[model samples]
Target: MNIFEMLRIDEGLRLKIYKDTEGYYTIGIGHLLTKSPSLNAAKSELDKAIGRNTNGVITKDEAEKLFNQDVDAAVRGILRNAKLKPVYDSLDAVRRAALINLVFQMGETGVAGFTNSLRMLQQKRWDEAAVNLAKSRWYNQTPNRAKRVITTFRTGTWDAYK
Candidate 1:
């Protein structure tokens, strides 16, 4: 699916999805509501709460609210610097999407900080590419996510793991 589809939003929703609020909104997945956030601004807040859950933290209502803000900024930073045309031109759609997701999670500095992974990609070394992709400080912090994304790099498929 396209990024927008993966995000479950269209162009119209994109702006709304990223909109800022005077106060936060609580996050829910499927049917479970987690927190009553202080604000309801941006999809990244929900994304981060999900990430926290991925890390085995049952986000407290307040923690989830705060984390939501942090993750929103992180996601915005990633998108703010993602000039994907050049990278997209070089990769297949799946790989491109995976790359975008990785960048989104890691931010521009974090992703571009990956010297070894960048080299492996430059050389088309798939195994090394995946390995290097998974070998980062961020990866250590989010092993499940790293594994899924690196697997995507390895297989050239954007198989959503969440």
Candidate 2:
């Protein structure tokens, strides 16, 4: 499979600005709006890659590269960031990737706090279940979020390459 196939690039392409899963001003693939020095380097790299100012711009090729950087990191980050060793190991590798995607969306505790959701996961009723994010205080306090994570909960194909 090609890079685009792995990431569904055409599907991720955003010619115009759009909200990411967390409602950030993301453009192309899933580049997050950043505010760090690393961000400066990132933008600069993208800028040079496509030969544009790239202050507020990103190309599909650039985005593809950006996405690749995180794939390996997010997989590892899930374990280190979450510290949910039991939870992390309990899941199969594919399911672990699915959970990694979740840890990517929110911080460790965000996923950890959803105790009920975890219970369902342990019960193997994950796909058939939905975490009542709408009912949680965290969910209410934090808007534009929990939705994607909830969406992840509501729908997981476990298609970790079948």
Candidate 3:
């Protein structure tokens, strides 16, 4: 699927000076803060891990690395917590991608708050689950994104991120 295109829309790109919802100095889709690196003695070490080294800007590849790092960990945590390991394992790639996207945006706990949706998913009531997904605050937050996930569920191809 055209996953990156979907997420590029989900997380806006900013190659130069950027800030997050918290008003921190940030950049890229993952929003790495480079606001002075840290005042403590561990500063250099911390900076080495996730800060700019005077470049004053980041590359798309670097942004992708950060995205991969965060998304990988998020997927692992969601895989463990969904407890629908078998169900998750059995899902088609798009459906799996849909849930992973949800988990990334809201975390496993927030996704779990969709008791009806989760239950419908586990029961393989996919049509209901898709509609159920559309009926939440998640749906209200970004109708476009919610539409894509539902499309991912229903069609599994050309996933409606449009």
Using TM-score, give the best candidate's number.
3
How close is every model to the real structure, measured as TM-score?
Answer: 0.50, 0.56, 0.73
By TM-score, the candidates rank as 3, 2, 1
User: Of models 2 and 3, which has the larger lDDT?
Assistant: 3
Q: Can you tell me which runs of candidate 2 are displaced by over 4 Å?
A: 1-11, 15-17, 21-23, 34-52, 123-162
lDDT of 3 by residue, 1-162 (tens): 444565667777876545554344655764445455343322343345456573446677777776777678767877787454545677777677777777766667788678887777877787888898898887886787688778777676653764
Q: Which whole-number lDDT from 0 to 100 does residue 132 have in model 3?
A: 87
Q: Residue-wise lDDT of candidate 2 within 1-162, one digit each (tens)?
A: 232343442225674445564445555655555433455555565566457786757656676676676565666665674445566677654456556655545546677776776766666675544554457764665544444444544554423222
Stretches of candidate 3 off by over 4 Å are 2-5, 17-26, 30-49, 53-56, 82-86
- Candidate 3 deviation (Cα RMSD): 4.5
- In model 1, the clashing pairs are 23-38, 23-39, 24-38, 24-39, 24-40, 25-39
| Minimal lDDT window, size 10, model 2 | 1-10
Q: What residue pairs are clashing in model 3?
A: none
